[PDB]
Amino acid sequence: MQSNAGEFVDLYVPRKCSASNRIIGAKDHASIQMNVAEVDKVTGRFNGQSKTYAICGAIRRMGESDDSILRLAKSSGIVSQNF
Amino acid sequence: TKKRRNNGRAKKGRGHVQPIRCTNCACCVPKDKAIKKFVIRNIVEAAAVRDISEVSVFDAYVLPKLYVKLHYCVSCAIHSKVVRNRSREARKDRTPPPRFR
Amino acid sequence: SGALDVLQMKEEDVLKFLAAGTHLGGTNLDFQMEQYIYKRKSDGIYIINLKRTWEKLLLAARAIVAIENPADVSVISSRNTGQRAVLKFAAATGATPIAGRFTPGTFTNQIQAAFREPRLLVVTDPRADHQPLTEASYVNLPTIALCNTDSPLRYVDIAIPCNNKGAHSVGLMWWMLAREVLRMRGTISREHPWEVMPDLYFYRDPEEIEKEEQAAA
Amino acid sequence: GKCRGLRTARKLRSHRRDQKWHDKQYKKAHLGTALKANPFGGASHAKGIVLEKVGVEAKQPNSAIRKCVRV
Amino acid sequence: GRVRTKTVKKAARVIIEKYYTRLGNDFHTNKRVCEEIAIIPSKKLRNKIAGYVTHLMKRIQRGPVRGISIKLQEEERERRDNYVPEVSALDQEIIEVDPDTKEMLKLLDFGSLSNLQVTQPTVGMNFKTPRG
Amino acid sequence: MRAKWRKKRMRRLKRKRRKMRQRSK
Amino acid sequence: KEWLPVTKLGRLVKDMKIKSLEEIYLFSLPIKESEIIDFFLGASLKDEVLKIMPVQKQTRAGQRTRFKAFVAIGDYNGHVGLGVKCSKEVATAIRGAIILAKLSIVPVRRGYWGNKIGKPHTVPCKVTGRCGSVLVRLIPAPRGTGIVSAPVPKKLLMMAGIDDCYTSARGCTATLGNFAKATFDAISKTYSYLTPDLWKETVFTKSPYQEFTDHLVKTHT
Amino acid sequence: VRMNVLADALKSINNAEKRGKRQVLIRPCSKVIVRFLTVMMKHGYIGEFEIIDDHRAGKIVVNLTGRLNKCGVISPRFDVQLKDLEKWQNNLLPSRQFGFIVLTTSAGIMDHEEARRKHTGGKILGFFF
Amino acid sequence: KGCEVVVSGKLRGQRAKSMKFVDGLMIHSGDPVNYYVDTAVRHVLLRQGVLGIKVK
RNA sequence: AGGUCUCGUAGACCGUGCACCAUGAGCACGAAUCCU
RNA sequence: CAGAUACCGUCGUAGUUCCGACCAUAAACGAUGCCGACCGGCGAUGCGGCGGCGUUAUUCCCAUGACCCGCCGGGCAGCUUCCGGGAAACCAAAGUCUUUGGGUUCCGGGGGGAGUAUGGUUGCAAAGCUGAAACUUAAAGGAAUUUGGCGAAGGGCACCACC
Ligand SMILES: [Zn+2]
């Protein structure tokens, strides 16, 4: 990433998964990019802001992706706390 | 190579079972390996039942049945065409053959 | 997606859910499905909590309305229960339908005439639609599925717990998702019901069609 | 390695000695029977005088006779 | 045997799909139609095509066909799935609610509803086929 | 010659060699 | 000397919207078009053949022979690729190997041995790949050493662009296809290894579809 | 039976890290296990780790994150010197820019760079990267 | 609509081997080969030997 | 008081093991790229 | 049958059965050492224990047995899985292995000669354990793929086949 001068030497920084905090390469095509719309508190309409999350291919192949997205919405407050 | 999940028989924790004899042959085969067939038969076959009921003195006489159990060595079973070879993918089918009549 | 007082149910959506039999599930259980069930009752039917289905449905509606192009949403059906339901859903929300005979290699074979590039995929049953989930794995395609308590949650992202056996519940939640997607888009009202008729998404066999032919003119 | 213990070196050394002994090249190069049966006696060259000139054929695929000598 | 070829069957299916109001059940009449509206390089091929057209008419006049879509036979499917009844089959006066899901609904958000009643549970718990 | 009958032939040869060795002491 | 982009990615690349191939690698899009890489990487993408071996399937009347060509292509400042195609003759087998190698191309990362001065020259850590029975290691080396290996992975890492490596192979090394695919798999997973140099959470930039949906609904059906 | 509790604990946390879970139930407790997990926490590899008090043997629940590649044990305990340690990090560490070797020292359970700057050495314990 | 070239003879060796170069559409039976495909057979006198050419 | 109660009869598992049947000389098997 | 001291058929001595004294050999095979930790799901089975709507040992109660619904522990197994491994067949162990170290016993270095010769030991005997060498050889093998041949099976065809 960094040298003694301070320049950036890598071509790009790869994506990191939101749930498992793993690393996503250029060969795992099962990785998704979920966009979740943010709704205003009073009008119940789309405003223009979104909360995006990345899910790795291994945890989506295993089947534990849905509770990972559910916990992401729990931490972000999209889904209800009592639920 | 290993052809089957088991060894063509039905022992898992025994090591030894008592031997039985074939019917067509006299081959000594283990009991859980031999292909059993408990056939259910009766005295007359299809069309002699009308002649038997015509000659039977007792009206509404129920006919008896013959119950025997048949034990086969696998070579004598395949040569008698009671069991046939199957494909590699369709070998793992423990369901019995379907009965209709 | 329902933590506030504006995105909850008041009195009548629960009446629709209890009338359509959505709460009545199956007799077996998937190992990721104990989150959305209450407990076993008599005769072995698992009952589904309604707020969990509500929150997953509104999360699916948020995921649908979050993308811009509505034609990028692809609806898939294979069973007879949800054929006209996804057609009416694609007519309402602007999606793109495949109902019956999803050919293999639809999303991968790039020289076919029917080759399509979606961005969001929704199906009706991952057991009945085990084939488009494989191409959804082979491309970057997240899936939202309408799962029962027995359905395996493999290659899925947003799972709506429901009953997908009877056509009544399938049609009711396809209509339900249509109305919440049209509400979050900003076309129809929120306090005035949009419920002109909810039987348009219901599936019916032609035996009752000829029955009402005998009954009426 | 299989037996990994902090106070285990004689067992490893003896087992390595036995498995090194149970070889082919090491068994040939460290036994006297091979050099006793060696005509040259473990040397590169040797002298000799000629008894007679004979002839032997080749194997099955190649058809020729190779003219060796008896020394 | 007399089994038609992919060419004859495909041409007959596409000539039914394109043209429907200019044909019929008489073999000679739609033989003349098939001669006029298409280019067929033989008489025997024309007769085979017209024969399969007549068989397709005899199939079509009974019921629906799974290979051929006809515009006159179309609009009927959306005619049957556009109209709606007066009763929505979702708003009744009685809903069959078990006591277990009634106690579930009481825990959820409500204390009472205006359209729900409580039934009795079964005396015996059998729900699976006998298989051991 | 399979392995078992080769073993039997080798056993017979061993018996004959043992007998001639014990009679030729 | 013409191009009709059948895919959405091809139209986005042709219409001067996607800048480099790095973000395509970042979001991990499947590149189903060959000449995207031709448009991005120009004349610097040098190719050579590895081995053209024949495979034979016997029939009733004689035996039918086919030739399969192992061809590696790559740019000497990063990206490297590898492709195997089996066809009837040799020339179109070579062309199929070119197109399938240009389809399957991945970027690599380069690190330092001990001290971080200047441009990166060696692999960042001990990476290992495996296919068949062939196990290939890639171990970092000091500056100015050079690649020590068999000639086939040596030329593979030179077309990768790394100057310094230490290698240790194991297995049936003589099978050149398995050895080449094992070395390519070993070098491909350098972005599959997590290091403390990039422990920070990546900001989620949007996909190019999310900003060019207007252009694609103008240019497509 | 059981010989090393640190080996079983490290194998269990490595397996649960590869499966992708977030909580690990380390069933033994030891001073060396708590010190090893403390070193891993201080070098930014794990988070909040628990010690469940019991009158039989303590249990440790850790808060995993997607940060650990492999942690392992070197059994039996090999003593090293200061000059001898360089071969150990040559053949055990994956790189010189990262990775650590934890070795037992009279100053306590503590890693290899600190043991280098304190001019000391001792028995080895394990490694993590 | 389609063509193919066949060259037969001693091609860089001792045994005679034939090279067939097919692409496109090509029929072979019935009457239409009389007036859709045109056949020409020629002999080539190389230094090594002879060579035959069929183009249709 | 009425008089063969009703919807179709695939209303075949009746069949086990079936004589004698050996041998095969060999020379020939070839392993592929580019647009000017 | 050309030969048939072989397949087949009829007799038939040792042996097959029991006791007492020997030998320690099997495809003694799950062709997979023992102990211990971790690592997915599901329907079942045998045992012991715990909890519960109901039916029965004829109608009330309780405990016991017999069904049904679940849980715990040990075990013989089974289905499924892109955890993972392998050359593959396959294996929830044959996984946690180059990112190589939980403890420990035995055991193999290309094929043949050869489980052979000598020596020791044991046994009434047959044989068991230990176990070479000279020489010869460029392959001997394991898994899987495609026409191949079956006096292999399942469906069809032909007066260059038969009736
Ligand atoms: Zn028999």
Offer a quick outline of the entry.
The PDB classes it as ribosome. The structure is cut from a larger assembly and holds nine protein chains of nine kinds. By secondary structure, chain E is mainly alpha-helical.
Keywords:
part of a larger assembly, 9 chains, D: 71 residues, alpha+beta, two-stranded antiparallel sheet, two-stranded antiparallel ribbon, 4 strands, I: 56 residues, binds zinc ion, RNA-binding, ribosome, HCV, ires
Describe the structure.
This is part of a larger assembly, with 9 protein chains of 9 kinds. Chain E is built from 5 helices and 2 strands, in the order ααααβαβ. Chain E is mainly alpha-helical and 132 residues long. Chain E has a domain of 56 residues: Ribosomal protein S17 (Diphtheria Toxin Repressor, domain 2, Orthogonal Bundle), CATH 1.10.60. In chain E, strands 1-2 form a two-stranded parallel ribbon. By secondary structure, chain G is an alpha+beta fold. In chain G, the strands form 2 sheets. In chain G, strands 1-2-3-4 form a 4-stranded antiparallel β-sheet, with helices on both faces. Chain I is built from no helices and 4 strands. The radius of gyration of chain I is 13 Å and the shape is elongated. Chains in contact: A-C, A-G, A-H, C-E, C-G, D-H, G-H. At the A-C interface, β1, β2, α1 and α2 of A face α2 and α5 of C. The structure holds zinc ion. The site of zinc ion has 6 residues of chain B, from loops. The structure holds 2 RNA strands.
Count of extended strands of chain F: 0
| Terminal-residue CA separation of chain A | 42 Å
Number of domains of chain A: 1
Major sheet size, sense and barrel closure of chain A: 2 strands, antiparallel
Helix content of chain F: over 70%
Radius of gyration of chain F: 11 Å
Order of helices and strands of chain A: EEHH
Q: Percentage of helical residues of chain A?
A: 10-25%
List the bound ligands: zinc ion
As a percent range, the share of strand residues of chain F is under 5%
Radius of gyration of chain A: 17 Å
Question: What summary fits the major beta sheet of chain F?
Answer: none
The helix count of chain A comes to 2
Number of strands of chain A: 2
Structural class by helix and strand composition of chain F: mainly alpha
Large-scale geometry of chain A: extended
PDB class: ribosome
Keywords: HCV, ires, 40S, ribosome
Entry title: Structure of the delta dII IRES eIF5B-containing 48S initiation complex, closed conformation. Structure 15(delta dII)
Chain A: eS21
